[PDB]
Amino acid sequence: MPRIKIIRRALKLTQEEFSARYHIPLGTLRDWEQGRSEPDQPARAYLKIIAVDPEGTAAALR
Amino acid sequence: MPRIKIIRRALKLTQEEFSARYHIPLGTLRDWEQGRSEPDQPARAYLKIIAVDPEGTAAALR
Amino acid sequence: MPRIKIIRRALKLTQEEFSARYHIPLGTLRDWEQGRSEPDQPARAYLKIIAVDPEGTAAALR
Amino acid sequence: MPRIKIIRRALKLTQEEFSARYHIPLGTLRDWEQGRSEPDQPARAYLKIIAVDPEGTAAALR
């Protein structure tokens, strides 16, 4: 399974919640989770930061 | 000036250095800095995290 | 309304059909149609070609 | 070599010319040609249309 889907489920967030908390448009989140497309390089780097620090990342965006 | 260019200069990094440290392909970094295109939503969110924590972000990617 | 939604409805295609015919991942099509994100420069150019020649474009991709 | 670089050289266009004619930001064109990143799905579809009809495509954008 795609890394974003692993990370989101491990944080116990719905797609809607993860989309709003981390500023990833919901359709593209769904594309990534379904294998319809893949995150580009800055997005992969961003997903790694979310994984390392989900709370710090979420707080920085608020 | 574009936010990425502000952030990079404030960190005293060349385009090459910033590109490698933060996993943003060099041509697209240059496009953003020159106003030839603009970062999408996940990229803007990512740039905000870099700005809030440049060292933590860089370390997480290593 | 977003240009892609105009074009798709004018061609009488569902989101699924338009996505498969024109190789635009379905989630991002939905993001564009709902105003959750906007097509980047190559995508806007591509949408203009689809609009000018929907059949020629579709045939070229097959 | 990347498809975009093949297509551009076969059309005898410089990077600048190809960028302006086909509305692909110059830095990202350079990233694609150098293997620093790869075109997403709508961009690949678009490049195929350019390849099939370079003149029709260019004219449609004017």
B34 lies in which domain range?
2-62
| Tokens read off for D16 | 């600048």
Query: Any CB–CB contact under 8 A between B40 and chain C?
Result: yes
Q: Using CB atoms, list chains with 3+ pairs below 8 Å to chain C.
A: A, B, D
Q: Experimental technique used? A: X-ray
User: Which residue reads 């195929």 in tokens?
Assistant: D48
Distance from CA of C39 to the nearest CA of A (A): 12
Residue D55, Cβ neighbours under 10 Å: how many? 9
Q: Which of A28, A48, A57 sits opposite B61 (nearest CB)?
A: A48
Distance CA C61, CA C2 (A): 23
Judge whether B27 and D27 are in contact, CB under 8 Å: yes
Interface membership of B7 toward A (CB under 8 Å) = no
> Which residue from A3, B38, C53 is spatially nearest to D28, judged by alpha carbons?
B38
Express the helix, strand and coil content of chain B in percent, nearest 5 each: 75, 0, 25
CA–CA–CA angle D32, D47, D7 (5° rounding)? 75
Q: Which DSSP string corresponds to B37-56?
A: S---HHHHHHHHHHHH-HHH
Q: Report the distance separating Cα C5 and Cα C27, nearest Å.
A: 13
Side-chain half-sphere exposure of C3, counting CA atoms within 13 A: 13
| CATH number of the domain enclosing B17 | 1.10.260.40
Sequence-distant (6+) residues with CB within 8 A of A3 are A44, A47, A51
Nearest-neighbour CA in chain D from A9: distance (Å) = 26
The total of structural domains in chain A comes to 1
Which resolution, in Å, applies to this structure? 2.0
